[PDB]
Amino acid sequence: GSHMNPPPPETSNPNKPKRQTNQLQYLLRVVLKTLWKHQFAWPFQQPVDAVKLNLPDYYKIIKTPMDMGTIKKRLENNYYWNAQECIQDFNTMFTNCYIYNKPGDDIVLMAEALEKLFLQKINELPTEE
Ligand SMILES: Nc1cc(Br)ccn1
């Protein structure tokens, strides 16, 4: 894409230790599956393209970007050591939306619907075995 967008968050690095856990499997098979297919997922399925959206200040304000396309790759390509890393990525994505946008903007309402589903699913995150 454009040189004016930052490189996306890391999704591959052999030096980072990796693990499969039952919790990370739940995050892929239950949490990501649920949110990815939601009617309101589409703004969150890839990094924000601030050039295409004409938001030149986006990456001036958002210095810790995250999106569900990145999270999907991280889950599918076993990037994580634990569930907390992945939950933090979802929380970062939601907070980016809430910080950048006005409350009640359409994307904020969309994020809030996804976050409500996320919370329900994370409250049922299984005990680590
Ligand atoms: N100068 C710029 C930068 C971005 Br990113 C988008 C539009 N104009």
Swiss-Prot record:
Free-text comment about domains: The NET domain mediates interaction with a number of chromatin proteins involved in transcription regulation (NSD3, JMJD6, CHD4, GLTSCR1 and ATAD5). The C-terminal (CTD) region mediates interaction and recruitment of CDK9 and CCNT1 subunits of the P-TEFb complex. It is also required for maintenance of higher-order chromatin structure.
Associated clinical condition: Cornelia de Lange syndrome 6: A form of Cornelia de Lange syndrome, a clinically heterogeneous developmental disorder associated with malformations affecting multiple systems. It is characterized by facial dysmorphisms, abnormal hands and feet, growth delay, cognitive retardation, hirsutism, gastroesophageal dysfunction and cardiac, ophthalmologic and genitourinary anomalies. CDLS6 inheritance is autosomal dominant.
Protein name in the entry = Bromodomain-containing protein 4
Q: In which tissues is it expressed?
A: Ubiquitously expressed.
Task: Share what the entry says about its subunit structure, partners included.
Answer: Interacts with p53/TP53; the interaction is direct. Interacts (via CTD region) with CDK9 and CCNT1, acting as an associated component of P-TEFb complex. Interacts with RELA (when acetylated at 'Lys-310'). Interacts (via NET domain) with NSD3, CHD4, BICRA and ATAD5. The interaction with BICRA bridges BRD4 to the GBAF complex. Interacts (via NET domain) with JMJD6 (via JmjC and N-terminal domains); the interaction is stronger in presence of ssRNA and recruits JMJD6 on distal enhancers. Interacts with NSD3. Interacts with NIPBL. (Microbial infection) Interacts with bovine papillomavirus type 1 regulatory protein E2. This interactions may serve for the tethering of viral genomes to host mitotic chromosomes allowing successful partitioning of the viral genome during cell division.
Look up what happens after changing residue 106 to G. Found in a patient with a neurodevelopmental syndrome; uncertain significance
**Originating organism:** Homo sapiens (Human)
Q: What does this protein do?
A: Chromatin reader protein that recognizes and binds acetylated histones and plays a key role in transmission of epigenetic memory across cell divisions and transcription regulation. Remains associated with acetylated chromatin throughout the entire cell cycle and provides epigenetic memory for postmitotic G1 gene transcription by preserving acetylated chromatin status and maintaining high-order chromatin structure. During interphase, plays a key role in regulating the transcription of signal-inducible genes by associating with the P-TEFb complex and recruiting it to promoters.
What range(s) does the Bromo domain occupy? 19-125
